[PDB]
Structure formats: structure tokens, C-alpha cells
Design a protein around this ligand. Structure first.
Ligand SMILES: [Mg+2]
Ligand SMILES: [Mg+2]
Lengths: 4, 458
């Protein structure tokens, strides 16, 4: 999972 | 009540946010999408008569002390106008390199003129941001879709004029820098919205705090100008310990560095090895403070992808190596903690915070008309305040000084304006004339600065  | 960004910029008379004085302030307010929702705010600050500007700054800004004195208001009024703008609720106050510069100027202006040097930046859902670290992060992490200009040396340039030009944006006027900053915010928001929204979310210190797991040494991406353009200002860091004094500073290790000196050497050694840098070649001490209150760019380590590390010449494998050695070595932790374990009041902002009573009393100072400052009965605890108060009255309201105060102001002016100082300053200008003989507008500015030292001093 990554924000950007 | 609606959220607004207030873009702003100072021109000053020198590099020192405390010892040098403001010349011009410029600002425009914006909605959450960067549509202009107000009028340009532009105005000057009259410099007090105990000060001569740094020649180099006038050459940059094009603003003589004569022009700022004639068109401006005393620093008390200057502070007032800025204060209003800044304290409108739900404002995000931002600029370009503002964190390391413009905010320091703002705090000193407030400190000198009896406003809280900090509250403006967090009260009523105010916050601050700095679009330079955004441009840097964007280049480092997610560059595609924007043109990234290189200077003559081959490294990336984050100067506003190059950036706008590289991206077909008109960059023309006090307002020009401010408009450029807006245009860059728009650009990054359009081309790269998820990063922009993430960084925006993480200007807040408690969201930053959540990223930091010291016991586990969770590695993070960090984008800082201290890392240098030659690696796109980026590395992987790991938190080792909290600063033992500064509640807002965490001690990071630079994982791309050389961690051998951490293990091998003792604390005293490392303290000045870290201090006296680039004289010993004796690998550098790979250790930097991150201040959660200074809008640092931080993100979970894997947002910097393998391919991203290749792009920037960062050695992914070496970094993972240094992390593994660190984790299995928690005596470095107590070692790094151990590393961290002026008579002019203008320069004393950071000698402590003012207590509640101190700060309530400066509040009365503010409320009092200049004329009734002599007749004021209140007491002060912190020893700086008397000093700030005399300087504040002499600089802004010389008419209100009594006999012994006028004398004291004179001795203070003689103290700065020494024969040594004046001859230097005269000689400085005269050499700059020669240096810039080809540059006619500068010759003229330089000459104007001479006219000003003539009148204000002898
Ligand atoms: Mg600026
Ligand atoms: Mg990529």
C-alpha cells in the first residue's frame, strides 16, 4: 500500500 | 468559514532574518484550488535610523532604503498589516523557501514588535507550507509530466524563473514571484495530484509524528536541500532517537552514508566531526536532525521505488545494508543522543519562550498608544522585554523618548555607526561600483546607497  | 492559501514573499535589506530589516512584503489570497480570491497586498517597511542595508541585497531587490522610507510605514505598522493577513482563520500561509527564510523574518518582525512570534502559524487551523520542498519532492519522487530544468553545472534548478520557463509559464513587479509560486502549485497539483495532496496532508506535525517509529527504526524517504541536488535532494533515513532537548527534533541517520564512524568512534569525536564538516578526508557523520515542525518531506520508505532510486543514483542495496547493521546495534542510539545531549536583543528570539504572564503583558504593550508607553506601570519577568521595548519605542516612535532616552538612542547609533564601520561601508560601495561598472542600474543603486549613508549617519 502506497499514498502516491 | 472557508480554507484559504495566502501566498507571500519578502524582499529584505540583507540575508539575516534577525539583524537585517524587511523592505517589502507581497501577498495574495487564494481558494483551495489556487484561484485568486483577493487583491494584491504590497507594501513597504520604513527602516529605522540605526540600520544600513547590505549592499548586495539592494542590488538584488532593486529597492533603495530611500524608496522604502518614503513609501513605507514604520515596522510596528508593517508588522500590524502582516499580522492581520496572517491571522485570518483557516489560512495556510506559504511561499517559496519561506520555511528557512520568510518565516524567520516574520517571527523576528513579530518578536521585535510585540506579537506572538508563533501563534499566527497554528491558531484557528492556520498552518504553513513551503512550495520549494514540494518542487524538490516532485522532482525526486514523481517527476514525469513536468519539465525539470538544469543549470550550467548539470544539476536540477529549483529557481522559480527556470521552473516557470521550462514549463511554458509567463514569468514577468512585487507580485511576480508570488504569481510564479501559485503557477507552480497549480502545476504540481494538476500533473501530480496524489503527491501534492499527500505532502499537503503531512505539513501537520502529528501526521509526521505518526510516520516515526524509533524503537523499530522504520526507514523513510526524506527530501531535503541538505542532501544536495546531486542526489535530487533525497535519501533513505532511519530514526534512531529523539533529540534530548528539542521536543520537535528527531535524530535521523542517512542510510546512503558511511555508518562505520557510528559504530567505531565515541561521542565527543562525532560531535565536532559532525560540526567541522568537509575539512577531514574521516568519512562524514551520516546524521541529521529532522524537525517535525518545519514541514519536512517524509514518506514511508517504499514510495521511493527501485526505479526511482536508479533515476537519482541512489544505491538501494547499500542503504538496506546499513539499516540491517544499525538495527542489530542499539548502542549507536545512546551514542547519537549524546552528540546533542550574543549581547544584541534583536538576535535573541531563541533564548526561550515567554511565559503566559510575560506574553499577556506584551499584549498590553500592543494595546497601548505609543504616547502612553512612558506612563506604563506593568512589570516584566523575562529580561529581553525591557530591551525590546526601548528599541521598539526609539525605532518607531522617536518623538516619545524623554531626554535620557534620546541620549541612550544616540549612544546606540554611535555604537553601530563606528568610524571602522562607516569607512568599510563607504569602501564596499566604491569597490562594487568598480566591479559592476558595466551594470549601469547597479552603479546607480550603489550610488543611491551612498547618498543614504551620507544623510542617516554623519
Ligand atoms: Mg523569496
Ligand atoms: Mg517512478
Amino acid at each position: 500500500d502506497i499514498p502516491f | 468559514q472557508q480554507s484559504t492559501f495566502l501566498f507571500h514573499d519578502y524582499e529584505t535589506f540583507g540575508t539575516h532574518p534577525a539583524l537585517d530589516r524587511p523592505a517589502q512584503f507581497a501577498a495574495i489570497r487564494t481558494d483551495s484550488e489556487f484561484n485568486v480570491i483577493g487583491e494584491p497586498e504590497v507594501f513597504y517597511c520604513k527602516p529605522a535610523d540605526d540600520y544600513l542595508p547590505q549592499p548586495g541585497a539592494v542590488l538584488i531587490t532593486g529597492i533603495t532604503p530611500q524608496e522604502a522610507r518614503a513609501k513605507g510605514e514604520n515596522e510596528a505598522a508593517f508588522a500590524a498589516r502582516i499580522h492581520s493577513l496572517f491571522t485570518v482563520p483557516k489560512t495556510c500561509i506559504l511561499g517559496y523557501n519561506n520555511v528557512r527564510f520568510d518565516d524567520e523574518v516574520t517571527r523576528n518582525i513579530f518578536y521585535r514588535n510585540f506579537y506572538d512570534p508563533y501563534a499566527w502559524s497554528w491558531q484557528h487551523d492556520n498552518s504553513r507550507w513551503d512550495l520549494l520542498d514540494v518542487m524538490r519532492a516532485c522532482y525526486a519522487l514523481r517527476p514525469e509530466g513536468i519539465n525539470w530544468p538544469e543549470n550550467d553545472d548539470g544539476l536540477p534548478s529549483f529557481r522559480l524563473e527556470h521552473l516557470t520557463k521550462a514549463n511554458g509559464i509567463e514569468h514577468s513587479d512585487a507580485m511576480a514571484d508570488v504569481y510564479a509560486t501559485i503557477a507552480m502549485a497549480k502545476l504540481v497539483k494538476t500533473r501530480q495530484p496524489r503527491l501534492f495532496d499527500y505532502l499537503f496532508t503531512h505539513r501537520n506535525k502529528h501526521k509526521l509524528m505518526a510516520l516515526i517509529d524509533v524503537p523499530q527504526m522504520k526507514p523513510l524517504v526524506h527530501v531535503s536541500g541538505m542532501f544536495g541536488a546531486w542526489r535530487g535532494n533525497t535519501s533513505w533515513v532511519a530514526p534512531l532517537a529523539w533529540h534530548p532537548e528539542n521536543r520537535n527534533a528527531v535524530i535521523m541517520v542517512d542510510l546512503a552514508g558511511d555508518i562505520s564512524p557510528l559504530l567505531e568512534l565515541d561521542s565527543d569525536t562525532l560531535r565536532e566531526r559532525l560540526y567541522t564538516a568537509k575539512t577531514d578526508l574521516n568519512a562524514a557523520v551520516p546524521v541529521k536532525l529532522v524537525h517535525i515542525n518545519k514541514c519536512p518531506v517524509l514518506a514511508q520508505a517504499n514510495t521511493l521505488r527501485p526505479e526511482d532510486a536508479d533515476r537519482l543514483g541512489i544505491n538501494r542495496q547499500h542503504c538496506l545494508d546499513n539499516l540491517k547493521i544499525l538495527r542489530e546495534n542499539p548502542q549507536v542510539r545512546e551514542k547519537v543522543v549524546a552528540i546533542f545531549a550574543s549581547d544584541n536583543v534583536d538576535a535573541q528570539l531563541y533564548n526561550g519562550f515567554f511565559s503566559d504572564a510575560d506574553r499577556a503583558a506584551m499584549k498590553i504593550v500592543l494595546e497601548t498608544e505609543p504616547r502612553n508607553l512612558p506612563a506604563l506601570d506593568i512589570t516584566f519577568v523575562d529580561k529581553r522585554i525591557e530591551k525590546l521595548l526601548f528599541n521598539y519605542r526609539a525605532r518607531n516612535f522617536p518623538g516619545t523618548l524623554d531626554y535620557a532616552e534620546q541620549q541612550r538612542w544616540l549612544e546606540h547609533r554611535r555604537q553601530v555607526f563606528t568610524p571602522e564601520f562607516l569607512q568599510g561601508y563607504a569602501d564596499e560601495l566604491q569597490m562594487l561600483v568598480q566591479q559592476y561598472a558595466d551594470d549601469k542600474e547597479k552603479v546607480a543603486l550603489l550610488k543611491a546607497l551612498w547618498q543614504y549613508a551620507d544623510e542617516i549617519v554623519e
